[PDB]
Design a protein around this ligand. Structure first.
Ligand code: HEM
Ligand code: HEM
Lengths: 296, 296
């Protein structure tokens, strides 16, 4: 039911392909089935790679494909924080993840043979897990991510309805200014995130500024926290552009919206303290149908 | 003696940084020691990663540093064929390789901290071994590469003299047109390379055109083969620029030159059949000193 790329944990490398439709939207129908078929035999060929992939679609493109059944919450990625979080909403998102760069590249090439004549690629980002699974800033990223199979399922996978087995996807590429980050003392960095750096222990939410990243994103509704499955990975070049490619899956887009509203100032006027050294430069929302509904 | 990045076999990832000198050349001296020191501590923290690196210098840059003793064959890359092989000779080449992307990136960031104020990066290329050690063309790459330690020393590391422990380096980034390649039938591609594609069997030098790649580069002097130690890896993006980052070390730049003369029409009038689908777009010669003469 669920596409294979949502639930796996601890991937070491990933490819994200963002693209707009080229020509008639209807060509995505056969391209998606061809890629899913190739994807399947790839996964049985390389079991030790823990390969997964998900194909997701933007609002206008999915409405034409659905159509326009389900995916109520899906909409074009708006702004947040008055341009602080820009919008670069595209039509198709392909996320490939596994333990191996070489397998990911064969799958991304298979995707490009399937979708080549009906998409125009806008960015292809190669993520990699860094040493000790730390963000390039030096902080461990992903500790409080849900785990494992059953919990991640209830957070990310739609349980019933037309969109059962589906999921909502948010992708946002950040560009780190590590020079600006290494201005701050390690203590100042820890107040910015909410956890100590080398030790990755959560700082109490009263000895920690309200602008801290954890205070921004640790949100509760009806006494229950709004959870997401994060598949983010560092990306880029040492001498050039680098940062975090943020990727989140959730059964409801609402959880992701609430955290963006908090982080970028549209909830209580306060902004995430990480904006002192890094900035998002892309942003889009996508609905990932079930592997079944992908008509493959 | 020898720098750690020349001899190791079976690396899974590599980073190449080509750059020009930014400011005065003398700043390279303390930078090279600072990086090579950090290099050794990285090798100690990751002893199982087969980590190595080499810092090499262009003609003018090395002549100043040398200066100008040794590196008799060192010179600016010409290059070849009235633009058939372009030349982009820079001053500094940093090559990092190991079994791990995450380790290589940390080493690359350490190099940018040591060299960041005396170099201007022109390109940073991230190489990865592809499935079955094949080139993105689908042909296995590396088969007749010298192996292992003893033979690779004989080929790549200078034995006697003031340059003992050093090596000559050629880097050349190619861009594959895989649409134009998958034009051709398998038999056509095999006649282009000189080896069978699936089984990687060498086709006999009698059943293959003189323009075949193997015929171009399998050369002999005094009845003895002109060997090189290649460290080339695929690079790039599925939907955009991709191909082979070519990289070779040799005790004599003369072995690399003759193969270049042959491939690009200066020896037979004939040129390498691989130009039917791939093209070089960068090119530089560098001299990698011994680790000790690197003042480090
Ligand atoms: C440059 C961009 C970002 C960086 C460097 C970053 C870094 C971090 C770090 C270091 C942690 C603590 C380790 C962990 O538990 O995962 C964390 C946690 C978290 N992040 Fe991010 N983050 C970024 C963007 C975002 C965005 C845009 C969102 C949401 C839209 C988000 C959602 C979360 C959540 C929900 C947690 C877990 C909070 C908890 O329940 O403890 N992050 N992030
Ligand atoms: C896009 C460019 C290139 C591609 C795709 C490519 C690919 C290959 C392949 C598939 C082989 C046969 C497998 C092997 O034994 O390694 C090979 C062999 C070889 N290549 Fe390349 N190559 C390229 C450029 C070059 C260049 C520029 C040089 C020299 C400057 C070179 C030197 C060699 C040598 C010396 C061999 C060993 C041949 C033998 O002794 O049997 N290659 N290459």
């Amino acid at each position: 039911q669920v596409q294979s790329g949502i639930l796996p944990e601890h991937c070491r490398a990933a490819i994200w392909i963002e693209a707009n439709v080229k020509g008639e939207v209807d060509a995505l129908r056969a391209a998606s089935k061809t890629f899913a078929d190739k994807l399947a035999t790839f996964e049985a060929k390389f079991p030790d790679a823990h390969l997964g992939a998900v194909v997701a679609f933007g609002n206008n493109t999915w409405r034409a494909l659905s159509g326009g059944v389900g995916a109520e919450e899906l909409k074009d990625f708006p702004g947040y924080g008055k341009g602080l979080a820009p919008t670069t909403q595209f039509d198709v998102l392909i996320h490939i993840l596994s333990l191996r760069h070489d397998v990911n590249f064969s799958v991304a090439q298979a995707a490009m043979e399937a979708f080549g004549d009906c998409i125009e690629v806008k960015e292809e980002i190669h993520g990699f897990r860094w040493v000790e699974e730390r963000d390039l800033s030096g902080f461990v990223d992903g500790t409080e991510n849900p785990a494992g199979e059953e919990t991640r399922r209830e957070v990310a996978v739609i349980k019933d309805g037309v969109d059962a087995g589906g999921s909502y996807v948010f992708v946002q590429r950040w560009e780190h200014n590590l020079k600006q980050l290494n201005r701050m003392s390690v203590h100042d960095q820890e107040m910015m995130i909410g956890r100590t750096k080398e030790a990755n222990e959560e700082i109490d939410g009263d000895e920690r500024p309200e602008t801290s990243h954890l205070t921004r994103v640790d949100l509760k509704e009806d006494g229950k926290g709004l959870k997401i499955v994060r598949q983010s990975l560092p990306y880029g070049t040492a001498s050039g552009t680098h940062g975090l490619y943020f990727c989140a899956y959730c059964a409801r887009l609402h959880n992701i919206e609430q955290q963006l509203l908090s982080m970028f100032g549209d909830t209580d006027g306060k902004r995430d303290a990480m904006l002192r050294f890094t900035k998002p430069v892309t942003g889009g929302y996508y609905f990932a149908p079930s592997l079944d509904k992908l008509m493959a």
